[PDB]
Design a protein around this ligand. Sequence first.
Ligand code: QMR
Ligand code: NAG
Lengths: 243, 264, 264, 264
Amino acid sequence: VDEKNQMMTTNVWVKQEWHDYKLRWDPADYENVTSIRIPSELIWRPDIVLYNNADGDFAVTHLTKAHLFHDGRVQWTPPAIYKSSCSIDVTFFPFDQQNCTMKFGSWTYDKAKIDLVNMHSRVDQLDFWESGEWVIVDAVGTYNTRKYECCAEIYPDITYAFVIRRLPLFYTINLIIPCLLISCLTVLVFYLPSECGEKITLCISVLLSLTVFLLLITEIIPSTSLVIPLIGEYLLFTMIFVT
Amino acid sequence: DTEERLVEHLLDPSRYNKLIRPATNGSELVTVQLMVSLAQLISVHEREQIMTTNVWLTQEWEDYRLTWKPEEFDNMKKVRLPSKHIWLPDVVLYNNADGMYEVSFYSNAVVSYDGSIFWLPPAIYKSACKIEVKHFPFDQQNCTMKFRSWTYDRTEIDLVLKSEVASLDDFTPSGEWDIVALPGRRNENPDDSTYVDITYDFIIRRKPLFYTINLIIPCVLITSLAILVFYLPSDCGEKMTLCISVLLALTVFLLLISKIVPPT
Amino acid sequence: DTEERLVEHLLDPSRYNKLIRPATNGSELVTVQLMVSLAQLISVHEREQIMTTNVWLTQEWEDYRLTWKPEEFDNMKKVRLPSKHIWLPDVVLYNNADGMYEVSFYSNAVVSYDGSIFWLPPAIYKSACKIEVKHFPFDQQNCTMKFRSWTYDRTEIDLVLKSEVASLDDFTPSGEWDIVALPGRRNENPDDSTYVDITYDFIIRRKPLFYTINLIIPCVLITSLAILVFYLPSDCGEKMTLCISVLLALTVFLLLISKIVPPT
Amino acid sequence: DTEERLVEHLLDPSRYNKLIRPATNGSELVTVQLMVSLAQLISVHEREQIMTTNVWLTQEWEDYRLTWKPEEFDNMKKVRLPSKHIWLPDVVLYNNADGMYEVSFYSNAVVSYDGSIFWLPPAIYKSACKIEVKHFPFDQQNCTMKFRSWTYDRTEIDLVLKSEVASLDDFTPSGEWDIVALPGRRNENPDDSTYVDITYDFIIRRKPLFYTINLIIPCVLITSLAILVFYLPSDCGEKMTLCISVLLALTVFLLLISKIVPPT
Ligand SMILES: c1cnc2cc3c(cc2n1)[C@@H]1CNC[C@H]3C1
Ligand SMILES: *[C@@H]1O[C@H](CO)[C@@H](O)[C@H](O)[C@H]1NC(C)=O
């Protein structure tokens, strides 16, 4: 989950299954076989395009072999990487909770010729590999139709929503502990007596250390302009009161 | 089944050689009406001057050896042909970084009974646009996109704009950069006689909050201590620390503003 | 000369077919015996938790419709075949970062006259592995490497091991990281009964000299001056310089061990 | 015209199956002679231990079923052929970092009427070599190159050298790294007997001026101020500034010298 470029790259296993009508036979006549496995360049397959792409394949491209049943029900699970684009809101930087989406749909057939029906409303996580930094709260998929600008038919699509939190202990122990720890040194220089000759050493060192912490926290957040992060407003008000 | 007999009839490789162009009547032009439609501006990259966009490029033209009588095939008006199996004029970018010239997907194409072909593939495109840097961070950039044909010229194909603006109703907010206008022009050259292209001009503007809060405010707070070492009496023995540290914080801020902007 | 006659006899498409598998006598399985052989640890990158290796994987199975008598063909026990025009099992990585699943080259397969087929391609692989960091940098990592089948499962093929370590014969030594042990296990799920995998584990010890010289010696030489501001007398006016310089040097070392180690 | 009749005669795919090897009497060998001609040494990268070079390697071998009777084809001694359609002996790298194994152009091969085939493709290669750094920056580095066959072995093809020192008169000079000596020799394993390779050694030397000027002179000019602090009087109030700033400049130089050298 890349916050400077606002991207999300996942490794996912797309499961599709459908019917046809010419790929059917009688199992009693061909020595009692039921199911075969033919490679997936030789049949029809539908065209499923991620609409939300940013530096993405825009379709599956590994082409795993397909399972065809006697009755014409075929099924197909090709794996893919996908590089989706989402919008990052960051106000509570220490304990964030983001919402990043995906939008699958068919490219050039409409609702009176092809039709998506979502199967299970969860995203199936029976072999998630535990990434450590982020945990999935929720992962749902909502069915949608939309009418576009070109053509007068309507088009179905399925929008997946991913609600993920950040486990916050690493940025707690490495960023707001030294910032909040040198932030209690700002009010101290008035206690120091003025014939020591050591006051403006302390004011210059506190001002330059908060300036280094603000110019290092401008790396990790994206450069948006709808919000400001709540740590950056505190660092700006502390720099105002130090000067 | 009748769709199968039509798709077998239309792409007979004895009948249909896809390397020729559909000229009739003693070398008329074919007219490729294109119009482009944005999806999202992904990123404007100031340091290497690359604008990455994601765009849909609707091209439609006229063919003449892909027709049928619709009574003979039980009232089809409109079929789908696997794209790149038919003829297509190569319409690409021309100001390109990284050498990806053609489109990214090669989807299906929708053939009527007229011979009119419709086509809409997507692309991600990386154009190389020239950054105005004077009023940073309040500036107003202007980036270009130039679509030319790739292998043909002006006596053979003929690009025609469809509508004067690029479309924008299938787009999401780009956040940091907002749009002002998107005109599109057809340039022919009067002198060359073999040169048509369609150039769009994205005119964008930076939302100036974030670079103000993280750059202009600590620069103003550091340069407000420029005039202050004269008001400080000399017997403390601390003038040198204040003016030396003001000059060092000022030169570190000059090098950071030197590493954001491009080196033009 | 006769080897061309043998390749013409075996891969005839009337006699041989590619898309089916050697299963007769009422759905027998086949046994794919696989074992890997290491070449070099290229890199362990802690910052994105990834590991790049260079693995030959050696597969043997038994394909029954590739046989001849060698007296007809000049006492040949052994030929080469192109690796696309036979059957393959499909064995890939399962926990792969960046999507590149299968092997690199498809090198040639050595086919005997029993039908027993020996085959080894080269591959590079970028596996993901959970970095255990508490004793940094004297640590001992544990990086997994899984292998499953891709299209088939346990009621059609059956993976089995050869020997219980990976072969370390062509392992050139690496420099930074040093191996300790490489066990190999076969796992199987008893609630599903349609699942095999063969997983290798690599248990790696880091040579500790480099990060000691750059990070442990200046950290102990800076934290040995923490309790020394008190013995300094108050007349000289130098307590603030020593204690402020110790606090800023410890914050700079805390941000360097922030930027190296993974952000779990 | 007659050359065109000859090239249709020679590469006829009923006559000439590509992926067998040219031998006639009960498995006799073929001899592949090779030598290496350098073009330039581009870079030696010390952070990741990788040498990038430009090298044309010349291979010549001897086929038998590329023969014509040259007074039938109107006194032709020497044709060119494209090298995707004849046999190749596979000669690759073997210590290769970043995983490109074949050559980069696949140029034409010159075929004489005897069958002796001359071939010279160009390549760039990213070889891996082990940088030793004790006498930095005056050292004498050593980087090797293995050429090994890829799908064959010692009882099938046999790599013979031609010149003990590889060719160096097409060399552009390299700026930093001058070349001292460059031999090459044949290795063969006395207990394995399925192993031939030809290894070249490159013995390169730094030119030491630029690293002396930038990292020995400011290092010595900083570290001569270690002994200075005892010659201050104590009453000035300026001891701790000098010795604290000397310690922080020294640890900055230790980290930058440790960013140049490898983490071996
Ligand atoms: C025919 C050919 N291409 C199309 C592309 C698209 C649509 C309709 C098309 N109809 C909209 C629906 N899906 C992708 C875009 C938009
Ligand atoms: C250079 O390295 C090779 C490989 O270890 C070795 O055979 C050779 O003796 C070395 N020569 C010198 C001069 O270091």
